[PDB]
Amino acid sequence: SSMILKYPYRVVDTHEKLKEAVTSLQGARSIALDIEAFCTTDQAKQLGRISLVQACSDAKPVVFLFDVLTLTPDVFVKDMQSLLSDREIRKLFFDCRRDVEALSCQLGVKPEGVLDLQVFFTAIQWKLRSVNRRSGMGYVLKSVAGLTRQEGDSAVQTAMTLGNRPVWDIRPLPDHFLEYAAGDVRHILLLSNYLVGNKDVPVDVVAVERLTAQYVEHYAVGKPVITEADATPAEVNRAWLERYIGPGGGCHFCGAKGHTEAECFKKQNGKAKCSFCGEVGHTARNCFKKHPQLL
Ligand SMILES: Nc1ccn([C@@H]2O[C@H](COP(=O)(O)O)[C@@H](O)[C@H]2O)c(=O)n1
Ligand SMILES: Nc1ccn([C@@H]2O[C@H](COP(=O)(O)O)[C@@H](O)[C@H]2O)c(=O)n1
Ligand SMILES: [Mn+2]
Ligand SMILES: [Mn+2]
Ligand SMILES: [Zn+2]
Numbered sequence: 001s002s003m004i005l006k007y008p009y010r011v012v013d014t015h016e017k018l019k020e021a022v023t024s025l026q027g028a029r030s031i032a033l034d035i036e037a038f039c040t041t042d043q044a045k046q047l048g049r050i051s052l053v054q055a056c057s058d059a060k061p062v063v064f065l066f067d068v069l070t071l072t073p074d075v076f077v078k079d080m081q082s083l084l085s086d087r088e089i090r091k092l093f094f095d096c097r098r099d100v101e102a103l104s105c106q107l108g109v110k111p112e113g114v115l116d117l118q119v120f121f122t123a124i125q126w127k128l129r130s131v132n133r134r135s136g137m138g139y140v141l142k143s144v145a146g147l148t149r150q151e152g153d154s155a156v157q158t159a160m161t162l163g164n165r166p167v168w169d170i171r172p173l174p175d176h177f178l179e180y181a182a183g184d185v186r187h188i189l190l191l192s193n194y195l196v197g198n199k200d201v202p203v204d205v206v207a208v209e210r211l212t213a214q215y216v217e218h219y220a221v222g223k224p225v226i227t228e229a230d231a232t233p234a235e236v237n238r239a240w241l242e243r244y245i246g247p248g249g250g251c252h253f254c255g256a257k258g259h260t261e262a263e264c265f266k267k268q269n270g271k272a273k274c275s276f277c278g279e280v281g282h283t284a285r286n287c288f289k290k291h292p293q294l295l
């Protein structure tokens with residue numbers, strides 16, 4: 001878990017390095033994936049030109065940064081297609097919608113065996129609280145693993161937030177861009193250890209796989225997606241949650257949707273609080289301090 005965050009990045013920008021990277025990823029059970037794309041003038045939904053594809057698997061302690069721009073999409077696809085198409089190797093994503101659209105549109109490939117960890121988290125929230133909101137990476141790492149992320153380089157982040165320039169076109173890439181690019185795939189693989197193969201997780205992995213497959217089918221159609229699967233960008237389709245995860249949950253104490261019994265203020269505020277000694281759990285009439293004859 002802690003070891004994954006210390007994986008160094010290896011830039012893959014030659015045919016020789018690509019063949020070696022493929023060989024490693026071919027022996028994996030799970031591969032975390034992400035993309036860095038050109039920032040657009042529109043700042044649109046559809047990702048710009050693919051610059052990097054980031055990969056980090058369980059087979060080797062390393063983050064591959066595939067320079068798709070240098071290699072070209074044709075070279076990258078020829079060596080990575082069957083790997084991406086192999087359903088026996090799980091492809092991990094954190095919000096896969098735009099990435100899947102980009103892989104379909106720009107690279108001509110639809111990945112198989114996809115698991116979307118953002119959707120996984122929302123599916124847990126649906127099961128327990130009838131909440132269909134998508135949460136950011138920082139929130140999910142905190143909530144699931146207890147970690148607080150460092151946060152990205154601010155000059156890198158400001159350049160992306162401005163969106164007046166491609167940013168990821170420039171070669172060679174400076175180290176603080178390469179480190180920024182490598183960050184999310186480390187976090188994704190780390191999250192999979194907490195969410196996948198864990199009996200305390202109240203949703204089955206196969207159910208989230210099938211829910212993720214609906215996203216992949218919707219977003220990998222060989223062309224730009226006009227109609228979104230979700231009502232707003234920061235939520236998950238409720239009918240899809242109903243179908244693949246089941247009914248939404250709620251508080252077992254007060255009956256309300258939006259929180260669990262462990263978070264319930266009505267439960268905690270409703271407990272007996274001793275007016276004489278202040279302790280929760282008994283009243284003053286049953287207090288041993290106030291009434292030592294009881295002890
Ligand atoms: N405009 C938006 C707003 C949110 N989102 C998604 O919803 C998540 C939660 O965003 P908020 O932090 O705004 O709640 C983001 O991490 C992102 O995946 C999006 O993709 N587009
Ligand atoms: N943690 C929480 C959150 C909400 N609640 C209660 O649940 C009810 C409905 O919650 P919302 O206000 O989120 O809709 C309210 O009566 C609120 O006080 C609670 O008792 N504990
Ligand atoms: Mn992404
Ligand atoms: Mn990223
Ligand atoms: Zn409650």
Ligand SMILES: [Zn+2]
Binds near residue numbers: 286288290
């Ligand atoms: Zn007392």
